[PDB]
């Protein structure tokens, strides 16, 4: 019962049991039927909260080592293994169900999933070293770029997905690519694109993302 498990994820989220929540949205996705607007949010809320738990616990342990120095290192890797397991799981849902079943002219769902795709490849790169890093950075770039071309072509600069895509892509350039100017340029362009069309504004979502762009622009 698909209606059953969507309620399960709404229940799990209320109990803030996000491991349980993402399993329901996972189950819902693998039935090969499209997701609604609220269903896309649930899946996005579910997996970002699980990754946020690994990547938060990872940042308090990796900063330590940077016999006692081994267990610090081995504990860092085990949290690292759990972090990659969650990313590859949601990346499987994107490649095998969500992005794959998308229509040609379903730009919002397309940019949304591709933005998610680039995000979790960016979370991978934050813990990545050596050969595996160079791989996940390029895929993140490949996913961010395709959503950028679709959003800049068919979506209003005030759309919270096109704004949220500009802020995560500019963060990727700054943190993972160390390209401060292209990060500044991409952030500043969309933020000014949105101010040029501020008269087009559910405006609170767009306004908050426009301020994070200026916050990041000032800190860069």
């Amino acid at each position: 019962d698909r209606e059953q498990l969507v309620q399960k994820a709404r229940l799990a989220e209320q109990a803030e049991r996000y491991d349980d929540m993402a399993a329901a949205m996972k189950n819902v996705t693998e039935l090969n039927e499209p997701l609604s607007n609220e269903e896309r949010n649930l899946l996005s809320v579910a997996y970002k909260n699980v990754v946020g738990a690994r990547r938060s616990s990872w940042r308090v342990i990796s900063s330590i080592e940077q016999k006692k120095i081994e267990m610090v290192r081995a504990y860092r890797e085990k949290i690292e293994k759990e972090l990659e397991a969650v990313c590859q799981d949601v990346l499987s849902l994107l490649d095998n169900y969500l992005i794959k079943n998308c229509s040609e002219t379903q730009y919002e769902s397309k940019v949304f999933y591709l933005k998610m795709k680039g995000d979790y490849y960016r979370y991978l790169a934050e813990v990545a070293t050596g050969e595996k890093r160079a791989t996940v950075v390029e895929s993140s770039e490949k996913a961010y770029s395709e959503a950028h071309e679709i959003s800049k072509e068919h979506m209003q600069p005030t759309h919270p997905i096109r704004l949220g895509l500009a802020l995560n892509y500019s963060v990727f350039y700054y943190e993972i690519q160390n390209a401060p100017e292209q990060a500044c340029h991409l952030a500043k362009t969309a933020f000014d694109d949105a101010i040029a069309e501020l008269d087009t504004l559910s405006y609170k979502d767009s306004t908050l993302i426009m301020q994070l762009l200026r916050d990041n622009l000032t800190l860069w």
């Binding site: 995560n168 500019s170 963060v171 943190e175 990041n216 800190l219 860069w220």
Partner: peptide, 6 residues
């Protein structure tokens, strides 16, 4: 660490 989308 910069600010991403919530």
């Amino acid at each position: 660490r910069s600010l991403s989308a919530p």
